[PDB]
């Protein structure tokens, strides 16, 4: 069978907490009053929810309501518990309230309003400094949630809200997040295809916080190289092929050997043999102003097959790429 793995950091953080912190199945949801909110307009739709701008009529505050499509009570409890545990943490979206439609019995999460600028219009405006700044802000949220025993498991641009005028950022959509427990075998069917870590793609279930760091690396690559998505796979199998064409097959097969991973036979046809590419092949006159030795060194240290060898969030924050950001923040 596969070789076990443990997180290098924050390994036992949940074991040391009271059971109630992580044992979300036992959480009792306190429902507020749906009549306190009036819906104003629809903001967006997902697979599993619809998001509206609303007003809290008790105090006239603008709020956001995420009405859940039908999902298991345990998964709703998980998201609520995680949001409550992380409330007040750096750059974490604040859950303000939880309500039910009395007739249709559908649950709705009520959040703080963030004045988001279209992240699909915000990447053509981003300077080198801006990317470093916002990356640092995301790392603060990830170090925090990891330190609190939580993997986000769905890091990607859609789940980062930015109020550019206020240089404000929030990490949202905790619906896939999970508590880290040493030894636990997780579902690999998480995250968007383009952001999935090698561990997911090869079906290695004993993963950890380091998944988030792969996803972050994918984001960074897409931003500095102006190539969204960076690893553009056609399906989950081809996704690993696209990664292998960059990181190379030698390190991939080393990873599978180290963890005694049983690779789906389907892969044997399509993976082939690929050299590890230098990052210089993605640099061009359009993106060169975003790319530095520091950026490439940092990126290289996020995008590793071996989850254990990726930078931690706290290590990433200490990287020379962020020296200018750190100097200004005091």
Q: Known binding site for ATP: residues?
A: 43-51, 66
Residue with Cβ nearer ligand X5E (173 or 208): 173
Please state, in angstroms and as integers, the Cα–Cα distance from residue 315 to each residue in 135, 279, 327, following that order.
13, 21, 17
Please state, in angstroms and as integers, the Cα–Cα distance from residue 22 to each residue in 19, 30, 140, 152, following that order.
6, 17, 22, 14
Structural tokens at position 116: 């988001």
Q: Minimum CB separation from ligand X5E for residue 223, in Å?
A: 19
Cα separation of 258 and 280, whole Å?
A: 29
Q: Minimum CB separation from ligand X5E for residue 175, in Å?
A: 7
43: contact with ligand X5E by CB under 6 A: yes
List the catalytic residue out of 143, 154, 173, 208: 154
Please state, in angstroms and as integers, the Cα–Cα distance from residue 107 to each residue in 14, 32, 130, 242, 293, following that order.
27, 11, 37, 39, 48
Q: Look at the chain and count its residues.
A: 330
**Binders of ligand X5E in range 112-151 (CB under 6 A):** 113-114, 116
For residue 327, give every residue at least 6 positions away whose Cβ sits within 8 Å of its Cβ, in sequence order, or none.
none
Cα separation of 294 and 223, whole Å?
A: 15
For residue 261, give every residue at least 6 positions away whose Cβ sits within 8 Å of its Cβ, in sequence order, or none.
2, 202, 203, 204, 255
235 is catalytic: no
Residue with Cβ nearer ligand X5E (62 or 266): 62
Residue with Cβ nearer ligand X5E (7 or 155): 155
Question: 3-class DSSP state for residue 164?
Answer: helix
Closest alpha carbon to 178 in 219, 155, 208, 200: 208
Q: Minimum CB separation from ligand X5E for residue 312, in Å?
A: 24
Q: According to CB under 6 A, which one of 6, 12, 20, 46 is a site residue for ligand X5E?
A: 46
The interface mask with ligand X5E, positions 60-79, x = CB under 6 A, is ----x-x-------------
91: contact with ligand X5E by CB under 6 A: no
The interface mask with ligand X5E, positions 157-196, x = CB under 6 A, is ----x----------xxx----------------------
For residue 64, give every residue at least 6 positions away whose Cβ sits within 8 Å of its Cβ, in sequence order, or none.
43, 51, 52, 53, 54, 110, 111, 112, 113, 114
Cα separation of 30 and 97, whole Å?
A: 9
154: contact with ligand X5E by CB under 6 A: no
Q: Where is the binding site, in residues?
A: 43-51, 66
Residue with Cβ nearer ligand X5E (195 or 321): 195
Residue with Cβ nearer ligand X5E (175 or 217): 175
111: contact with ligand X5E by CB under 6 A: yes
Q: Minimum CB separation from ligand X5E for residue 2, in Å?
A: 33
Cα separation of 182 and 22, whole Å?
A: 13
Q: Minimum CB separation from ligand X5E for residue 98, in Å?
A: 12
Binding window for ligand X5E (CB under 6 A); candidates: 42-50, 206-214, 297-305, 315-323: 42-50
- How many binding residues for ligand X5E (CB under 6 A)? 15
Residue with Cβ nearer ligand X5E (140 or 319): 140
Contact status, residue 236 vs residue 196, Cβ threshold 8 Å: yes
Q: Say which residue the tokens 């760091």 belong to.
A: 213
Q: Which residues are catalytic?
A: 154
Residues within the interface to ligand X5E (CB under 6 A)? 43-44, 46, 51, 64, 66, 93, 111, 113-114, 116, 161, 172-174
């Amino acid at each position: 069978g596969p070789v076990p793995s443990r997180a290098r950091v924050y390994t036992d953080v949940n074991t040391h907490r009271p059971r109630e912190y992580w044992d979300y199945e036992s959480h009792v949801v306190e429902w507020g009053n749906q009549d306190d909110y009036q819906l104003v307009r629809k903001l967006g739709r997902g697979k599993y929810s619809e998001v509206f701008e609303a007003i809290n009529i008790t105090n006239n505050e603008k709020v956001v309501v995420k009405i859940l499509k039908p999902v298991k009570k345990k998964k709703i409890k998980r998201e609520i518990k995680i949001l409550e545990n992380l409330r007040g943490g750096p750059n974490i979206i604040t859950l303000a309230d939880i309500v039910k439609d009395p007739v249709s019995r559908t649950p709705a999460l009520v959040f703080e309003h963030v004045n988001n600028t279209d992240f699909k219009q915000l990447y053509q405006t981003l300077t080198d400094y801006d990317i470093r700044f916002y990356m640092y802000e995301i790392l603060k949220a990830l170090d925090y949630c990891h330190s609190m025993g939580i993997m986000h498991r769905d890091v990607k641009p859609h789940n980062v809200m930015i109020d550019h005028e206020h240089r404000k950022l929030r990490l949202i959509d905790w619906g896939l997040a999970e508590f880290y427990h040493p030894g636990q075998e997780y579902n690999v069917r998480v995250a968007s295809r383009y952001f999935k870590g090698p561990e997911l793609l090869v079906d290695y279930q004993m993963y950890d916080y380091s998944l988030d760091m792969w996803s972050l690396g994918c984001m960074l690559a897409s931003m500095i190289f102006r190539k969204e998505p960076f690893f553009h796979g056609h399906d989950n199998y081809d996704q690993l092929v696209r990664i292998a064409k960059v990181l190379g097959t030698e390190d991939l097969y080393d990873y599978i050997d180290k963890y005694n991973i049983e690779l789906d036979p389907r892969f044997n046809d399509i993976l082939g043999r690929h050299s590890r590419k230098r990052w210089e092949r993605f640099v061009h006159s359009e993106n060169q102003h975003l790319v530095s030795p520091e950026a490439l060194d940092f990126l290289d240290k996020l995008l590793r097959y071996d989850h254990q060898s990726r930078l931690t969030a706290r290590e990433a924050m200490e990287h020379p790429y962020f020296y200018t950001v750190v100097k200004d923040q005091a």
